[PDB]
Amino acid sequence: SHYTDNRYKMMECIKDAGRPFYPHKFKISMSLPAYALKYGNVENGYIDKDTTLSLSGRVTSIRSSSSKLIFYDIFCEEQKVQIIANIMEHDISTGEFSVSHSEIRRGDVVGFTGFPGKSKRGELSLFSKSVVLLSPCYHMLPTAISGLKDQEVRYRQRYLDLMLNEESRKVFKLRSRAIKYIRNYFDRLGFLEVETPMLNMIYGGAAARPFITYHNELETQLYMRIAPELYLKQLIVGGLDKVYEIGKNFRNEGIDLTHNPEFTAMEFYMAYADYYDLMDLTEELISGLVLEIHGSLKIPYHPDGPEGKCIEIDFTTPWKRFSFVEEIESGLGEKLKRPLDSQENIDFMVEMCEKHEIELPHPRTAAKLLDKLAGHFVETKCTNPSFIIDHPQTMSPLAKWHREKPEMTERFELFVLGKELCNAYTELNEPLQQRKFFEQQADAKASGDVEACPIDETFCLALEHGLPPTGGWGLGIDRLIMFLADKNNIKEVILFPAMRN
Amino acid sequence: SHYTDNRYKMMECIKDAGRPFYPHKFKISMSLPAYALKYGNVENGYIDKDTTLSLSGRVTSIRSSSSKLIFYDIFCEEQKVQIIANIMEHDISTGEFSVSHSEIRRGDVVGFTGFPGKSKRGELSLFSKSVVLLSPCYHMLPTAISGLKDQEVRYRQRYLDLMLNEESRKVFKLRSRAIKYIRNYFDRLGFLEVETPMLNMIYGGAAARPFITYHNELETQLYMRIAPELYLKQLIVGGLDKVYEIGKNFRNEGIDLTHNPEFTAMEFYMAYADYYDLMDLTEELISGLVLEIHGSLKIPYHPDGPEGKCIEIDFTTPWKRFSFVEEIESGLGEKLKRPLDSQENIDFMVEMCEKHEIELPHPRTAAKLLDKLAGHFVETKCTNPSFIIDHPQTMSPLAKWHREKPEMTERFELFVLGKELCNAYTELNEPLQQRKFFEQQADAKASGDVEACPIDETFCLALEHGLPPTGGWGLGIDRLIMFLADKNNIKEVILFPAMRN
Ligand SMILES: Nc1nc2c(c(C(F)(F)F)n1)C(=O)N(C[C@@H]1CCC[C@H](C(F)(F)F)C1)C2
Ligand SMILES: Nc1nc2c(c(C(F)(F)F)n1)C(=O)N(C[C@@H]1CCC[C@H](C(F)(F)F)C1)C2
Ligand SMILES: N[C@@H](CCCC[NH3+])C(=O)O
Ligand SMILES: N[C@@H](CCCC[NH3+])C(=O)O
């Protein structure tokens, strides 16, 4: 583009001519919001020539009325302000009027000095005496996001989106608000925030494939964490009683509308809680947050974008419970075979997958067959926030056995609109079984399950030091933001999401 | 150890005998702190047989004073409570007294039921009627950390440290407190907290060697971030005006008393600030925090451990400023040669390193020679919090040129006791020079500097959209905690630090 070359040329001319070239410091008198608060209610035509103010922003508009009168719009911190540059007021010590204003283009970051007030037409304005070019824009911008080559530019160059699109800026403000709310909830319960390692010698705590890396000086290979769970439980052994962590997990898997290779998770571990206690807590925390944000527990969601259909999601507590196996058996019209991890049941589940046209997993472990069936028959029933509960042990290697139900565990997942938000259980604290389930997992891994985790002997050793009865819990913050902010694409709620190259 | 085998054997016997085996849920009447608050001031010998309470904790002591009377200490949430188990009071429906208490060992997590009050000797106590084994400890514990095989166990098995050492628990409480204080500081200034990616296609923003990894589905190699700087500055282009991030950096380098391959950094970017503004902010923030924690700006530090010498560090503002080159030239007793990146000056600086017995760097870039000299002559003068300022451009590729001093930049580092805490500058916002400095860096990388960063074209493109005059800043949280908590080893302030294997 000729535009970019010419701008570099202009800037060189400016520098060689000793005119202001990327000034180090511009001292604003106040923010534009603070300016609008102070002068926004004056009478039309008001002007205070006894007050000289410095304002700065990005130029969004340039209109000349004549050779002697120029109108700018500047924008900063969510506030627009009009600048009215009259040659009569121009401070000649900063250069000839025409020269000073010839250096300014739309998109430029500029400073102005002058007198506060309002135009006769009633527009909040600064009656300028000078202009300074602080940081030029070397590209022709559109006036809105619809003027971009394509809408993927919004993600590859988020600065453009944030520049031009208020709706985008609002998502990240809301993200901050929601996380404050969540921290505060747990802070008031006497929780302690902790940081456990993102570099792991052994990955674990989730069904996910890891990123791999290497620490050269210590000549050891490492994994990025898929979850902090195995570390956090050790803190409960250590007696910290109530801990939470909020931070990135890394999952080496495909991207789509609800997946990004890194995302923000929260986990908490609470000693002496069980999964029943955690369901109540989840309801209180999430319903509270929804209410804080929306003023109501019934909120809009647009699955197919903002001009498509609108459904209502009802966060009124208590939420529906679906029992994992029973709901699968309702869909099937007959019972799964027992034991659930028997060859008999693996075969049966394969048969049922073919019959109901469900894509089979690989490998064909009982765990992954159960997961496919739950995805078809149960997750699809979860429009309003719903708990799927009482997952089989065979797919729940870190969850404590159900106190009433054989083969099951004290686990729940929270689904909203068929997407998983939370995953929680009464924590397994018996090390003999834990070692056994880790072995079954390593066996699955060797059989080609890329989401099965290796044995962690250090974790087993920690359990041998006595983990109190404990309840644990994780939440995908980003998917939560998708619901609160009404977005159907993860890329909307992460500043710099991953993209195909 | 026979002990571990026998405990597994006991637990099997318990299960086969139908006795309580890892109960799922134990409902406490109140916390131990709450128990101490309620019954701590009763008269000696008080007992309320009309109130039955459930308490739980980890057993820290077992004294059988006779065949009929056992004294336990349990500990939980920073509170010890004595249990007095009299055969006279035992609920026989839970088993024979001797049988019930034979299942309990030091280190066990246990529940007790009984009557609140105080012993005749005046010890806060529960007069128990039952005991439940909730989670046994299968290993013989010491009573304090000095009873561990070696003191590195504290780090390889942090649960033991946290179990046994109050001072350890205090560090991580203080860590949480300090980060709350810091977030609050910036929150009240109208900052927005953000998350930028830890998986990067191009690493940048610091002198550090990166971890390397690979995203299989997108068939692309990735770096873990060494700093969020290049992303964060794009948010200022986008107009967010004030942003901070608190989160892990990853640096693939050797470990020692002040280095860990991952650590917690905070960066913030404030539009319209310069490095002068940032020095004032740093003083206010850190002096405030010190005062909050210590009740004074003068605090103790033990560089050689708790039985060694003690220095006093004085955080009284304003802090000393040392000009980088001038202080080096004072130490040398002559001037560096100009330009600073000339072959003449490289040679000179090599000569001076040999003369003053300073370990040479590899490769021998001007930047790294300057660093070694600053390490010898300037960093060593920084006992009390001190700013080193006005670093050469050649070692400061993202810092804006000094407005007065040729070849220098508007940068500072904050040092306390010769260790770096902060690094900050008036941000370079001129894309022509930025591209040039990135080229010099890539050239250094190709010459074998593993801490030099490649060119980031996407960042250059962002600068071409106009970065406002901006001030940026980073802080090593963990090193700060070392000073606040008086620890001379990074491993003290990170829950699960890296270890040689
Ligand atoms: N690759 C990937 N994987 C997951 C998620 C994401 C993303 F970007 F959408 F945020 N990307 C997510 O939100 N997930 C829900 C899980 C539901 C249960 C709790 C966990 C937890 F604990 F990690 F937060 C997340 C998976
Ligand atoms: N490998 C490594 N490197 C650094 C640090 C650490 C550790 F473990 F101590 F935390 N380990 C640290 O604290 N560093 C100070 C820097 C001082 C200036 C600001 C930066 C920043 F940006 F990361 F905050 C940290 C380096
Ligand atoms: N680690 C789980 C969340 C916590 C489960 C309960 N301990 C996950 O990533 O899904
Ligand atoms: N990225 C720097 C901190 C910020 C420097 C100022 N932009 C570091 O890691 O030391």
Residue numbers in the entry:
A (entry chain A), B (entry chain B): 45 to 545
Which statements did the authors publish about this structure?
We recently described a series of Plasmodium falciparum lysyl-tRNA synthetase (PfKRS) inhibitors as potential anti-malarial treatments.(8) By using a pathogen-hopping strategy and exploiting the high sequence identity between PfKRS and C. parvum KRS (CpKRS), we demonstrated that an early lead compound from this series (DDD706) also inhibited CpKRS and displayed modest inhibition of C. parvum growth in vitro. Medicinal chemistry optimization, to be reported separately, delivered two lead chemical series that demonstrated improved potency against CpKRS and selectivity over its human orthologue (HsKRS). A structure-based drug design approach was used to optimize these inhibitors so knowledge of how the compounds bound to the enzyme active site could be exploited to provide additional evidence of on-target activity. In both series, the cyclohexyl ring pointed into the hydrophobic ribose pocket.
Although DDD508 originated from the same chromone-containing series as our previously published CpKRS inhibitor DDD706,(8) DDD489 is structurally distinct. DDD489 and DDD508 showed a loss in potency against the modified strain compared to wild type CpKRS, providing evidence that CpKRS was indeed the molecular target for both compounds. One compound each from Class II (DDD489) and Class III (DDD508) displayed superior efficacy and lowest parasite recrudescence in the NOD SCID Gamma model and merited further investigation. From the BCS, it was likely that both compounds would have low oral bioavailability due to suboptimal absorption because of restricted solubility (DDD489, Class II) or permeability (DDD508, Class III). However, DDD489 (purple) reduced parasite shedding below the LOQ and was able to prevent parasite recrudescence. All individual animals were negative for Cryptosporidium infection after treatment with DDD489. Additional mouse models allowed us to differentiate between the two late lead compounds as DDD489 was superior at preventing recrudescence. Conversely, calves that were treated with either DDD489 or DDD508 did not shed any detectable amount of Cryptosporidium during treatment or up to 7 days afterwards (to day 16 PI), demonstrating excellent efficacy. Resistance generation towards test compound has previously been observed for another tRNA-synthetase inhibitor in the calf model.(19) To understand if the late and sporadic shedding we observed could be a result of resistance, DNA sequencing of CpKRS was performed on fecal samples recovered from each of the three Cryptosporidium positive calves from the study with DDD489. No mutations of the CpKRS gene were observed in any of the oocysts shed from any of the three calves, confirming that this effect was not due to resistance generation in the target, CpKRS.
